[PDB]
């Protein structure tokens, strides 16, 4: 087959979609609650912002 | 330092293998399209996607593919010179010359000189041409029986194409145009009209040389004593085929000075036409409305936008001339027509003549959905009208469909009984190649080729020169009873051209390639 990309189907795209989605939950796992922990937001310039609010994290 | 820097030399062992592999690969390219049940091919150009098209015609494949090998390049244009003068048998001249060289390499492996095979093939060609002379039957009388034989060769030509589904309606129009002609085989008397709308079975026919062009704005619908005069001059505006000339335009009055020069120069041109004493005017270029009003008041029909098929065909169906210049009158022969009727077929203005001198002209009006169907149907009727006009000059016909080929294979085998030894093996090579022509036809239809073709050897040996292959049932039947026959001149032309081009390949033992610039 000659197409304009790469094709992949089956249950392997189901397992890759839940591992990419649950990894985002680990970014907002420890920051939940009033005692949530801060997390470093590294920018492309080089500076970092220390935010613990989960709305500003996502 | 013998042949370097682009130069390449094919030796005695190299050019013998290159000429055989290159000719077989072209021969095996279009052997799948052989027969009525042939396969199709995919043709597409490299680097482009809009050129994707599927056609199983043998000439349409070979005209499009580029050829790199020089030994196979003389085989490709051999199928092209069969296509223009005959129009039928393009697939047969390729695969028979390829099968002749496919059995020739078995002889060269058996230590036979190629010039020995040339002298053997020249004797086998005359015996195979004599078998068609004995089996040919003519029809001087019984034109209702001659009408059957024209319909059999029309369906054989129309097979393996797009029109093989509705071929029962097209064979009643292509044969009827031949019987109404009844004379020379000039195909300029028959016109092909391509109009959109309608299916293939909705094709009409006109016996009065129907034209596929509309004329004027307000043309007279009926004219008696139509006097035809054709010309090729520019009548629309100025700068006729002149590029680079410019007129200075300073105001709106300078625009009208161009029109005042246009109204004066066109008035001198119509006065050159009406001094001839004519009643109908045909031109290749468009005619403006102001000389159209001069032609309408004088009672002269102005026919506009004539192509190369317009001037060349109307010069002989009306008895006129080309007459490109009309600067001086009374030096040209004029046409003749009784009545010109305007008929609307396909929602277009169509020009119908009636009562012309040499009134054997006809017109098959084809109907289709788009232009790709009509351009294919225009080629579908063009190759059929060539071989139908061939049978008018020579009404000899032979039984096709493997009957004439197995009779040719039996006639060469009888010549192998009375021959010297070194010419006997070369004539046996001609005998096996003639048996392979109904073999690939039977193999393309999916039948048992070892059961159908090899049974014709035992059938044609002891009399019975009427049985052939019937692809409708897949059983050997009588071709004279079922009505399957072909022409004699086309079947003789595919025998001579496939044997002469096969003589070129065996004569060549060295290919010299120069330096490409």
């Amino acid at each position: 087959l000659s197409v304009f990309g790469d094709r992949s189907t089956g249950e392997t795209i189901r397992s890759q979609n839940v591992m990419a989605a649950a990894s985002i939950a680990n970014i907002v796992k420890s920051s939940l609650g009033p005692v949530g922990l801060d997390k470093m937001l590294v920018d492309d310039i080089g500076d970092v912002t220390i935010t613990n609010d989960g709305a500003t994290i996502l | 330092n013998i042949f370097k820097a682009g130069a390449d030399e094919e030796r005695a062992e190299t050019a013998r293998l290159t000429s055989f592999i290159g000719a077989i690969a072209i021969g095996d390219l279009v052997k799948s399209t052989l027969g009525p049940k042939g396969m199709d091919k995919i043709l597409l150009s490299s680097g482009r996607d809009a050129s994707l098209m599927v056609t199983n015609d043998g000439a349409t494949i070979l005209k499009n593919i580029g050829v790199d090998n020089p030994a196979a390049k003389v085989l490709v244009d051999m199928s092209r010179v069969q296509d223009d003068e005959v129009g039928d048998g393009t697939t047969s001249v390729t695969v028979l010359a390829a099968e002749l060289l496919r059995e020739a390499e078995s002889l060269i492996a058996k230590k036979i000189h190629p010039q020995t095979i040339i002298a053997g093939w020249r004797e086998a060609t005359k015996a195979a041409r004599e078998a068609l002379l004995s089996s040919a039957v003519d029809h001087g009388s019984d034109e209702v029986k001659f009408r059957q034989d024209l319909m059999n060769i029309a369906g054989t030509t129309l097979s393996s194409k797009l029109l093989t589904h509705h071929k029962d309606h097209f064979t009643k129009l292509a044969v009827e145009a031949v019987l109404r002609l009844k004379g020379s085989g000039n195909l300029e008397a028959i016109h092909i009209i391509k109009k959109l709308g309608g299916s293939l079975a909705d094709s009409y026919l006109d016996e009065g040389f129907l034209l596929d062009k509309k004329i004027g704005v307000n043309q007279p619908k009926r004219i008696e004593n139509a006097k035809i005069l054709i010309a090729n001059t520019g009548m629309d505006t100025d700068k006729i085929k002149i590029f680079g000339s410019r007129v200075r335009v300073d105001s709106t009055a300078k625009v009208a000075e161009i029109e005042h020069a246009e109204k004066e120069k066109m008035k001198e041109k119509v006065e050159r036409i009406l001094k001839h004493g004519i009643n109908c005017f045909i031109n290749r270029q468009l005619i403006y409305n102001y000389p159209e009003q001069l032609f309408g008041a004088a009672g002269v029909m102005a026919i506009e936008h004539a192509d190369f098929a317009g001037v060349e065909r109307l010069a002989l169906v009306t008895g006129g001339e080309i007459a490109s210049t009309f600067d001086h009158p009374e030096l040209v022969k004029l046409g003749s027509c009784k009545l010109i009727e305007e008929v609307m077929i396909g929602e277009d203005k169509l020009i119908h003549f009636s009562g012309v001198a040499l009134g054997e002209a006809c017109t098959i009006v084809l109907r289709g959905a788009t232009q790709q169907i009509l351009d294919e149907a225009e080629r579908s009727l063009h190759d059929a009208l060539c071989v139908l006009a061939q049978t008018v000059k020579d009404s000899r016909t032979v039984y096709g469909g493997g009957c004439s080929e197995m009779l040719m294979a039996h006639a060469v085998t009888q010549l192998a009984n009375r021959t010297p030894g070194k010419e006997a093996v070369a004539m046996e090579s001609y005998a096996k190649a003639l048996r392979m022509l109904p073999t690939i036809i039977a193999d393309n239809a999916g039948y048992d080729s070892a059961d159908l073709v090899a049974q014709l050897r035992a059938a044609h040996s002891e009399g019975n020169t009427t049985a052939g292959l019937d692809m409708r049932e897949g059983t050997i039947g009588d071709m004279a009873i079922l009505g399957i026959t072909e022409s004699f001149q086309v079947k003789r032309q595919v025998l001579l051209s496939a044997a002469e081009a096969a003589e070129v390949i065996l004569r060549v033992d060295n290919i010299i390639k120069a330096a490409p610039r």
Partner: protein
Amino acid sequence: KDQDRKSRLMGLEALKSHIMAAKAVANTMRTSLGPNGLDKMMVDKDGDVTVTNDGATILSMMDVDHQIAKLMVELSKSQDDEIGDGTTGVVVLAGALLEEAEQLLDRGIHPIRIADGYEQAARVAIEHLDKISDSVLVDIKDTEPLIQTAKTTLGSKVVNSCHRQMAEIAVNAVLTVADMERRDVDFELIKVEGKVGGRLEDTKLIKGVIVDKDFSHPQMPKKVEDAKIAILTCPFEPPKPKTKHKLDVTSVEDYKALQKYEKEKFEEMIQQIKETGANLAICQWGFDDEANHLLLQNNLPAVRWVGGPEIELIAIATGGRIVPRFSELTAEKLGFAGLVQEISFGTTKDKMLVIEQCKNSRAVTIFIRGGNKMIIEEAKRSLHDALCVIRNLIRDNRVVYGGGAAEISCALAVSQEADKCPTLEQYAMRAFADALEVIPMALSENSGMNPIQTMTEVRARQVKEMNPALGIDCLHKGTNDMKQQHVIETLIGKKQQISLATQMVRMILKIDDIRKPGES
């Protein structure tokens, strides 16, 4: 300069490398020998295809890079005017002479002994050809056996189907431009043209000059019986330059004045043909519509659009001169012709001009016809090969039987005279006898027979049976003795075939070092 990147070949291996450069040329053309020679595919530089087996087309088109193989190209410039029939014959003879000399080089003999030994045995083979040659036209002239010998050299190609009427044409063309007692036949006085369409039987012999140009008007007369032809460069009209006139007009006062100024020029130079006495006006450029109306009334035809070399080709045959303008018009430079006619060919609009003298002229042109353009260029060379054989017959009416009959009898005399040579050139004389047998051996190999079985049967025939030589059955005829089959070669064509073959081996064997500087 440029010592680095330079190919060198010295020592004993350079001698065998020059042999291998010549063995590649001989082995390709040993298959294209005789009337049964195999065809050769030629691939052009732009992509055209033309197939032939002629020897002169092989050597001219073979783009070889070796200088030893380039020396094999040099012989074709002088052989086609001399023999015309053995172009394939001298290449296999120069190659097979080096084949046995390759065996002689293994013994250690110097090539200056082989090149002198080949020249020693060549004088024996030349002297043996004069003893076995038979005359044809001694003490008298005749045209009947000259056509029969011309039918054999012409029918070796694909044009054998119409070899009868074309052989009578080349005999009358040579006898018109040249006399048999003068023995000076000019190839430049015989021209060959051709056009597509027709058959080979429609070949006409035009005693004069032909150009592919029509008249200036279709109402012009097609018959000029008077021998007064004016050949000029400017047409009898108002004067126009060579590329573009570009007349400038301002208004109707300049158009009316230039029309009367042109009407005087339309009346003067048209009537300037009658003051001298000329009838035909061959001009380089065409005529206008006003000039063509005046040429019809005064009965003066004219030829339009005559090219560059087409003007000078007419004035040589008719005896005219290139006149630059109307002021230099004299009656002495006017051309002479017996019949000037226009001949059309069916529906084709060529309409070439046929200028005939209707007498014994000195420049005759041949117009050949055919169904394909590749056959017309083949039939032109086919008649050119026939012109050289008749040229060889005039210089010497003695002929020797070809087809291998002269080659085997020469090999018997050289091998008999080789035993009377008590020096180191004896092996070179026996080498010349073995290489002389290769040309009749390659004739039987191309015919599909056994080459060694066909050769040694004639050895018992030319010795035990009869002392006159017998030929080798190449065209699959009834039996041997091709003298009865009328296949006879010329004596000058057979003597110069031996001499040119010895000349090329002498120049190859003496060369022992090549230095080719490359790129830097």
